[PDB]
Amino acid sequence: VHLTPEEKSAVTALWGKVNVDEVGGEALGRLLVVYPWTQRFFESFGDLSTPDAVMGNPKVKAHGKKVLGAFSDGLAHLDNLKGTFATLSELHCDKLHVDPENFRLLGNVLVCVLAHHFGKEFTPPVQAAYQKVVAGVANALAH
Amino acid sequence: VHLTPEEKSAVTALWGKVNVDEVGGEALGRLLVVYPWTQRFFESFGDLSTPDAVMGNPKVKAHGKKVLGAFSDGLAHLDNLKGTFATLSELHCDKLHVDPENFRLLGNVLVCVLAHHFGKEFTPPVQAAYQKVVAGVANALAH
Amino acid sequence: VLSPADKTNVKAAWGKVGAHAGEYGAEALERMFLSFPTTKTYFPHFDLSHGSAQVKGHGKKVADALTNAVAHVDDMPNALSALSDLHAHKLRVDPVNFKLLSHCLLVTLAAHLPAEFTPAVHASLDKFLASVSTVLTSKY
Amino acid sequence: VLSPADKTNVKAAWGKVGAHAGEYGAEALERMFLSFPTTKTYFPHFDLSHGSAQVKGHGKKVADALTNAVAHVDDMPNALSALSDLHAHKLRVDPVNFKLLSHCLLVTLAAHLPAEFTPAVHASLDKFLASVSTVLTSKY
Numbered sequence: 193v194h195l196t197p198e199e200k201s202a203v204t205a206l207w208g209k210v211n212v213d214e215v216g217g218e219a220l221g222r223l224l225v226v227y228p229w230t231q232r233f234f235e236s237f238g239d240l241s242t243p244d245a246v247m248g249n250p251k252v253k254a255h256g257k258k259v260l261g262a263f264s265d266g267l268a269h270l271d272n273l274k275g276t277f278a279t280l281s282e283l284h285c286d287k288l289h290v291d292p293e294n295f296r297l298l299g300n301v302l303v304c305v306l307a308h309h310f311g312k313e314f315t316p317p318v319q320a321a322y323q324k325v326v327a328g329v330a331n332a333l334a335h
Numbered sequence: 336v337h338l339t340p341e342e343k344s345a346v347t348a349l350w351g352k353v354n355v356d357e358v359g360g361e362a363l364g365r366l367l368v369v370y371p372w373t374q375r376f377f378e379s380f381g382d383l384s385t386p387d388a389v390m391g392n393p394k395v396k397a398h399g400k401k402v403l404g405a406f407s408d409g410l411a412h413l414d415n416l417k418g419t420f421a422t423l424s425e426l427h428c429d430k431l432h433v434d435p436e437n438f439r440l441l442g443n444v445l446v447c448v449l450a451h452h453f454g455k456e457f458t459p460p461v462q463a464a465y466q467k468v469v470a471g472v473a474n475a476l477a478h
Numbered sequence: 479v480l481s482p483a484d485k486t487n488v489k490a491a492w493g494k495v496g497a498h499a500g501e502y503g504a505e506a507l508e509r510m511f512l513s514f515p516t517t518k519t520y521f522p523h524f525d526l527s528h529g530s531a532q533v534k535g536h537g538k539k540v541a542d543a544l545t546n547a548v549a550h551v552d553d554m555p556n557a558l559s560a561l562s563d564l565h566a567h568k569l570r571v572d573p574v575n576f577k578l579l580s581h582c583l584l585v586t587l588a589a590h591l592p593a594e595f596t597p598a599v600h601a602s603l604d605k606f607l608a609s610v611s612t613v614l615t616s617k618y
Numbered sequence: 619v620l621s622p623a624d625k626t627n628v629k630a631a632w633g634k635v636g637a638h639a640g641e642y643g644a645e646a647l648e649r650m651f652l653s654f655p656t657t658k659t660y661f662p663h664f665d666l667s668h669g670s671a672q673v674k675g676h677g678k679k680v681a682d683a684l685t686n687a688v689a690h691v692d693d694m695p696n697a698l699s700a701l702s703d704l705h706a707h708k709l710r711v712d713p714v715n716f717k718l719l720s721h722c723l724l725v726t727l728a729a730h731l732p733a734e735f736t737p738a739v740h741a742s743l744d745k746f747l748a749s750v751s752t753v754l755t756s757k758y
């Protein structure tokens with residue numbers, strides 16, 4: 193994804209202050225709560241009935257950390273998103289059968305989680321830069 | 336767009352029996368009727384109030400002829416769609432500001448027009464091959 | 479949110495569909511399976527081959543549900559409540575799949591009713607199928 | 619259909635928004651313009667720069683419409699009928715843009731009400747904004 197030098201610098205600086213363990217689980221849990229049809233892919237995680245049970249699920253927390261680790265790996269390689277996400281794209285398409293629209297839903301949920309965590313520091317320019325990175329990761333995963 | 340040899344042979348044979356002037360205007364007119372927000376782009380063409388006015392519009396017919404010519408050009412180059420659809424992608428993005436979802440809507444409308452024209456000859460395998468070509472043209476235009 | 483004109487269009491088109499409803503539903507399901515293979519993952523226990531009796535019976539059920547929706551067009555949300563509960567709460571179907579099935583139903587209708595598939599009837603049927611999908615994707 | 623619990627959450631979230639609604643609407647519009655520049659084509663006569671009084675007034679109008687929708691959550695379709703006619707028949711706005719504005723509104727609400735933006739409130743607000751977008755895109 194092409195970003196200006198200011199956009200890339202802002203994206204990396206906000207990312208450094210991200211807590212890897214907390215943010216990804218919160219985005220995965222909020223995806224599962226807001227879009228309840230996504231629980232079809234995670235019914236093996238255990239109890240996902242109430243939002244309080246979804247956000248208190250260690251499996252959801254651990255999977256979210258792996259999803260955020262993948263997001264960080266994509267962020268470190270913004271010029272080769274289609275290359276860093278090839279194996280994950282194959283995994284999500286051929287064996288899991290996940291629609292590409294759900295990747296965009298998860299990216300928007302992650303943007304909301306970042307806004308919730310950073311408040312006024314999540315300026316509209318930072319949000320625009322993160323929207324483009326999230327769309328690029330979704331497009332790379334959808335290939 | 337990757338297709339089997341049988342898929343490519345079936346797609347080309349159905350395309351040979353397509354009437355270039357009639358099919359594209361019918362797909363453009365049906366797009367304008369079924370999805371009325373698309374007339375924002377075609378306001379210059381003229382009266383588009385009723386479906387009868389839309390389908391009896393010479394500007395709509397001529398533009399549909401152009402669009403179907405582009406579709407045929409993409410069909411003749413199915414292995415380089417992103418290359419043949421680069422100038423059109425730039426035109427539809429930078430100057431016209433058309434959403435990529437509308438390309439998929441138009442492709443589905445074209446598939447319906449082909450089914451309506453060819454009847455029982457439009458078998459489910461032919462439809463599947465044509466859906467893949469239509470998605471590839473939409474992805475190439477959305478680049 | 480449908481109008482009396484498109485309601486009349488839908489009633490006429492589905493009445494002309496008539497007794498071919500189950501066959502048309504099976505054909506639409508076959509088209510969806512062939513064109514969008516991801517939708518096959520919702521039917522892991524089915525035989526999804528051509529001429530399959532399981533797909534034929536399911537298409538009959540879907541066509542009967544659509545016929546009931548046409549007959550109860552003014553009260554679809556409470557006419558399709560059990561189906562809404564099944565598809566949303568139990569099956570957890572992505573709404574994109576509802577869009578895909580509506581498209582394949584439209585393609586079958588176009589291929590089988592050339593004269594009936596005018597642009598006005600096409601728009602009416604698109605709106606009716608969108609209404610059905612909206613009802614079936616609502617969680618209570 | 620909007621759940622009574624989701625309805626209570628939306629009223630508490632928007633009541634806590636309170637008098638900051640016009641600024642939140644203007645900031646959401648700014649976010650939409652910045653992240654989705656294709657939406658700026660609907661405002662060709664506007665000054666869409668940062669701190670623009672035109673965007674500030676439009677955000678005030680959008681926030682007042684959302685406040686009225688919250689106050690009339692039971693009867694949004696006829697509480698927002700003039701807005702539906704304006705957006706669908708006159709402006710011809712793509713529904714994808716309604717989705718984008720709803721997302722930017724959610725982002726503004728998250729950035730301004732951290733404690734209030736629980737996952738349950740987030741889901742309630744997402745579905746309330748989806749219902750508003752559905753009403754505004756309904757053509758009749």
Ligand code: HEM
Pocket residue numbers: 230233234255258259262263280284288290294295296298299329330333
């Ligand atoms: C949008 C960006 C996404 C990224 C970067 C991402 C990342 C990942 C990663 C790194 C894994 C590896 C887990 C492993 O190998 O054990 C994974 C697995 C998985 N992903 Fe995603 N994911 C994304 C979106 C989604 C969405 C939207 C869904 C479902 C709606 C989903 C469903 C799954 C499932 C079910 C697994 C396997 C988990 C299991 O079997 O326990 N992913 N994902």
Ligand code: HEM
Pocket residue numbers: 373376377379398401402405406423426427431433437438441442472473476
């Ligand atoms: C696969 C989808 C599409 C293809 C292959 C296609 C192809 C074309 C072609 C060949 C032209 C003529 C370019 C020229 O004359 O230089 C054109 C122009 C145009 N297209 Fe499309 N198009 C597609 C989808 C759409 C959609 C969905 C819309 C609107 C909703 C749209 C709006 C326009 C407009 C407004 C013009 C310019 C017409 C004018 O200025 O009079 N196109 N497109």
Ligand code: HEM
Pocket residue numbers: 517520521539540541543544561564565569571575576577579610611614
């Ligand atoms: C207009 C749209 C649809 C209609 C009218 C419809 C109708 C029906 C009906 C009548 C049944 C049988 C329920 C019963 O016998 O109690 C059923 C079941 C089912 N439907 Fe749908 N459906 C629609 C869309 C979809 C879509 C898009 C999918 C998946 C992509 C889907 C997946 C299923 C599944 C998996 C079952 C269970 C069948 C079984 O396990 O035996 N449905 N539907």
Ligand code: HEM
Pocket residue numbers: 657660661679680681683684701704705709711715716717719720750751754
């Ligand atoms: C999603 C919730 C929305 C609400 C509550 C809303 C509300 C409003 C209101 C109250 C007005 C002023 C009408 C009047 O004063 O008579 C307006 C006008 C307008 N809206 Fe929206 N709107 C929404 C979505 C959108 C979106 C997504 C777009 C475009 C991307 C849009 C484009 C416009 C335009 C172009 C105007 C005309 C303003 C002018 O020309 O001065 N609206 N809207």
